[PDB]
Amino acid sequence: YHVLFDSYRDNIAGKSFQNRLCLPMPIDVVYTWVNGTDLELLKELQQVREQMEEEQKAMREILFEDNEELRYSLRSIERHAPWVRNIFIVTNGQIPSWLNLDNPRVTIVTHQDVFRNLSHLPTFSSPAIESHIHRIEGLSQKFIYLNDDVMFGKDVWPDDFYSHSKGQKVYLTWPVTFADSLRYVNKILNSKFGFTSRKVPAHMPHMIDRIVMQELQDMFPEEFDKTSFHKVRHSEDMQFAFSYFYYLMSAVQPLNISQVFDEVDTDQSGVLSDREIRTLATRIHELPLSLQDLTGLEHMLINCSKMLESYYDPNLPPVTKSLVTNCKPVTDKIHKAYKDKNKYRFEIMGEEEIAFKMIRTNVSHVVGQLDDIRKNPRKFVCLNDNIDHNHKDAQTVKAVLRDFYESMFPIPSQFELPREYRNRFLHMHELQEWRAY
């Protein structure tokens, strides 16, 4: 209503500060989903055969099952993060069988649109898909990247990914074919932004800015092409969390002398007075300010005018922006005092709202981990499903995981086709674990 619109101009200034008070909206969610079908497995087999043939030629020169983790992740999106505008899922050409495509808020984005160089799209490698989400048409400027196995909890909010005051929120972990990529990107970033002891980010829903990601891609045009070229995840490729966040944390912005002059000129009258010249002297020199420093500043100023509301020294000309921006000694001292800032703001937190649990084929340990998740709910829950799949305790662990998923998120979502009539997944395996224990 009009009163709500006119209530943001009810302040003393009379302006509207929606852009500084109402968070970045809209925010979208991007998923990467792959299915273990026969055709895709055959294509992978052909690609591996080609890889082996290439290795043989080089040496001659010398001479399956998913625990429907997308369904529950989408349910978590709808339940805990209901402020998401649209949901994008990137797939080869595959559409989930349970996905309700009639919903306008869910879209399947194939690899034709995502990839730029259409001689690359049979790509079968997660970093290559990860390279080009920011090129999705219709995607909001800030979007959250979900990895199809990470879920939500405790009713997350956009305040958990970005803040207008402290910028994006970076969640880091243990210090630094996937560890090789981390080492390679560490070397590449040390080459550009200098050597720094770096940690690696956590596996969790990552908020990504399209402008920042595009700037990162433009900064390394050749290297991101290697990531896209490789049709199997290589030792040398650029990641998603590590590359984006550390470019965000090490983006250097050159000093704007006009900004210094404007922040000092409180009158906004173009000319500086003795008080503003004195605050220049304070910000430039090191405290305490001896009058020698201020007299030297005025001396460098009177020199420059000769080469190119009354002040105490009668010989000092009116100090406009042109004098300070053209006087080399003053600009040199300004650069030496105002050294390089950071182009992007960021905030660093620990692993306190992140649940990365490792599921290895031990029903007692799996139940223990899931009970730990149940007792203390956490905002970001990730469950890596590396079950042996050839073991006496594979179906039992799958049943335990599905029971945890159905306990956390039981209600079917709006993105799911009307289904699961008489589905009745095995309800007796978890009872077998109960009876054995």
Ligand X SMILES: *[C@@H]1O[C@H](CO)[C@@H](O[C@@H]2O[C@H](CO)[C@@H](O)[C@H](O)[C@H]2NC(C)=O)[C@H](O)[C@H]1NC(C)=O
Residues 205, 188: Cα–Cα separation, whole Å: 25
Residue 274, annotated as binding a ligand: no
190 counts as binding Ca ion under rule CB under 5 A: no
Select from 59, 61, 62, 82 the one that contacts a copy of itself (CB under 8 A). 82
Pick out residues in 174-193 that bind ligand X (CB under 6 A).
none
CB 127 within 8 A of CB 229: no
414 counts as binding a copy of itself under rule CB under 8 A: yes
Pick out residues in 293-312 that bind ligand NAG (CB under 6 A).
296, 299-300, 303
* Chain centroid offset of residue 112 CA: 24
350 counts as binding a copy of itself under rule CB under 8 A: no
Residues 366, 167: Cα–Cα separation, whole Å: 37
What minimum distance in Å lies between the beta carbon of 218 and a copy of itself?
30
For residue 145 the two structure tokens come to 């990247």
When the beta carbons of 238 and 408 are compared against a copy of itself, the nearer one is: 408
Pick out residues in 8-37 that bind ligand X (CB under 6 A).
35-37
Q: Identify any residues that bridge with 171 across adjacent strands, giving them in sequence order.
A: 349
Residue 265, annotated as binding a ligand: yes
Angle subtended at Cα 425 by Cα 424 and Cα 429, rounded to the nearest 5 degrees: 125
Residue 269, annotated as binding a ligand: yes
CB 276 within 8 A of CB 266: yes
Burial class of 174 by CB neighbour count within 10 A (0 to 12, 13 to 18, 19+):
exposed
x/- mask, a copy of itself, residues 355-384, rule CB under 8 A, reads: -------------x--xx-xx---------
Select from 6, 25, 49, 95 the one that contacts a copy of itself (CB under 8 A). 25
Select the span of 82-90, 114-122, 186-194, 330-338 touching ligand NAG (CB under 6 A): 114-122
267 counts as binding Ca ion under rule CB under 5 A: yes
Residue 267, annotated as binding a ligand: yes
Distance separating the N- and C-terminal Cα atoms of the chain:
61
When the beta carbons of 40 and 276 are compared against ligand X, the nearer one is: 40
When the beta carbons of 96 and 153 are compared against ligand X, the nearer one is: 96
When the beta carbons of 262 and 332 are compared against ligand NAG, the nearer one is: 262
**Virtual torsion, Cα 74, 210, 177, 112, nearest 10 deg:** 70
17 counts as binding a copy of itself under rule CB under 8 A: yes
x/- mask, a copy of itself, residues 124-163, rule CB under 8 A, reads: ---------------------------------xxxx--x
Residues 430, 424: Cα–Cα separation, whole Å: 14
Strand-strand pairing, 27-32 and 142-146: parallel
Rounded to 10 deg, the angle between the 274-284 and 328-337 helix axes is: 50
